[PDB]
């Protein structure tokens, strides 16, 4: 995640193993139950896309759901690209590039790039955009997996 250091700057720090394991354990115990979404939300505080793929990729089991989510993440990403067209002409030397759906999904962007966008002024909330897609896709799952 990207956290504030004592000095008063935003720097990246790694997520903790008993945080990781707590994510694992939630999924083990409460599967598709709604409490998973606030839980997720708390444990995703200050998290990167990269950390969010890590969390999704480290799941075991419920592979039908994991595939449905993936496909929702790509749909929501396809929709990001649709709604926000690429911008006019070449990229400025003085500036950094606008993200695509795949940069938001973490796929085409690097960590330093993910830190550029979030730490820069104005900052862009690529975590929160992926977060809604995850929560939206979580609703899809919850609604389906209701019996």
């Amino acid at each position: 995640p990207i956290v504030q250091n004592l000095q008063g700057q935003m720097v990246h720090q790694a997520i903790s193993p008993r945080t990781l394991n707590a994510w694992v354990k939630v999924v083990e115990e409460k599967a598709f139950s709604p409490e998973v979404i606030p839980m997720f939300s708390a444990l995703s505080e200050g998290a990167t896309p990269q950390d969010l793929n890590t969390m999704l990729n480290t799941v075991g089991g419920h592979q039908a759901a994991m595939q449905m989510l993936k496909e929702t993440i790509n749909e929501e990403a396809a929709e990001w690209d649709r709604l926000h067209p690429v911008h006019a002409g070449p990229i400025a030397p003085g500036q950094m590039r606008e993200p695509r759906g795949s940069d938001i999904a973490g796929t085409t962007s690097t960590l330093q790039e993910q830190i550029g966008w979030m730490t820069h002024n104005p900052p862009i909330p690529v975590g929160e955009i992926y977060k809604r897609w995850i929560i939206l896709g979580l609703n899809k799952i919850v609604r389906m997996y209701s019996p």
Partner: protein, 74 residues
Amino acid sequence: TSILDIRQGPKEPFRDYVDRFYKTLRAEQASQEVKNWMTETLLVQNANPDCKTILKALGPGATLEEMMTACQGV
């Protein structure tokens, strides 16, 4: 176990089968286009006659929530 060896039981819920499929698909490393081909093809083909029948009625263009809710009573 190979991906061709993944098949749906005569009493096995589709759901439990689809989970097995994307787990084994998760251990295949092929190009995405090939894996798309595997998705639309092999999944239905090794699905059981009762659900297979059901899935034929969904037609093409169908997505996983609709397949998964379609074969639920089977």
